[PDB]
Amino acid sequence: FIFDENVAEVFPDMIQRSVPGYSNIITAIGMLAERFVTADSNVYDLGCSRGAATLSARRNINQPNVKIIGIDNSQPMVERCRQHIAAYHSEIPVEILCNDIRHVEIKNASMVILNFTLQFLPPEDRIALLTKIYEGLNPNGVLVLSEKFRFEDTKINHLLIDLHHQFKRANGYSELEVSQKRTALENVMRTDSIETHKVRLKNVGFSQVELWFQCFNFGSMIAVK
């Protein structure tokens, strides 16, 4: 399982059937962009995929001189992203780059989005990235971090994983061809608890850090510089 032509194609439907609340987060990201994106700044969408978060933010930014930069290291993903974005008109320019988030520069940002992406980085690479993001954000800038969480409490972790399997079934997740390779990946994915995420965000330097959304074992938080 890699992010190839096939995963890039079925992605909106795969993530819809597997991430509870996915869609509400995307809508909320637009609300957050309205609140946090300032004029004359940049907005980064890290591991941007098809550009759902990117367009949600773009559609809700009404400030001048704002630029969006989406980054995804998969070429198949980046091609559909750029094309998907050129299909909607806007006076806000968007540059989509094909790189690995660990090497990109982040500067003059009012908003950074890591929407279910951090979990795909080696655990030992996460602090460095979040640190670079903290340094690249302007004062009062915001990091929106959505992740699949693990729960220290075993019994709760299983209860939530089960609710997550009830949701996947309800949505016919297994109908997808990518369904099993995808499910194998999540089994070996090194996810963090919500508390781990908060403590690390605070250690990097963010002043405000809080979970603002959750549905079973998936959620999203915000860290304000």
28, 32, 52, 160: which one binds ligand SAI (CB under 6 A): 52
**Using CA atoms in the order 106, 109, 111, 114, what is the torsion angle rounded to 10 degrees?**
0
115, 133, 216, 225: which one binds ligand SAI (CB under 6 A): 115
The least CB distance from residue 130 to ligand SAI, in Å, is 13
The least CB distance from residue 104 to Cl ion, in Å, is 19
C-alpha pair distances (Å), 61 with each of 30, 45, 219: 8, 14, 23
| Residues that contact ligand SAI, how many (by CB under 6 A) | 20
Q: Does position 11 bind Cl ion by CB under 5 A?
A: no
User: What is the number of other CB atoms lying within 10 angstroms of the CB of residue 52?
Assistant: 22
22, 44, 116, 216: which one binds Cl ion (CB under 5 A): 116
User: What is the number of other CB atoms lying within 10 angstroms of the CB of residue 173?
Assistant: 19
Q: Does position 100 bind ligand SAI by CB under 6 A?
A: yes
Which two tokens mark 162?
């089960």
Identify the three-state secondary structure at position 141: strand
Known binding residues for S-adenosyl-L-methionine = 22, 47-49, 72-73, 100-101, 115, 182
The residues that touch Cl ion, with contacts defined as CB under 5 A, are 116
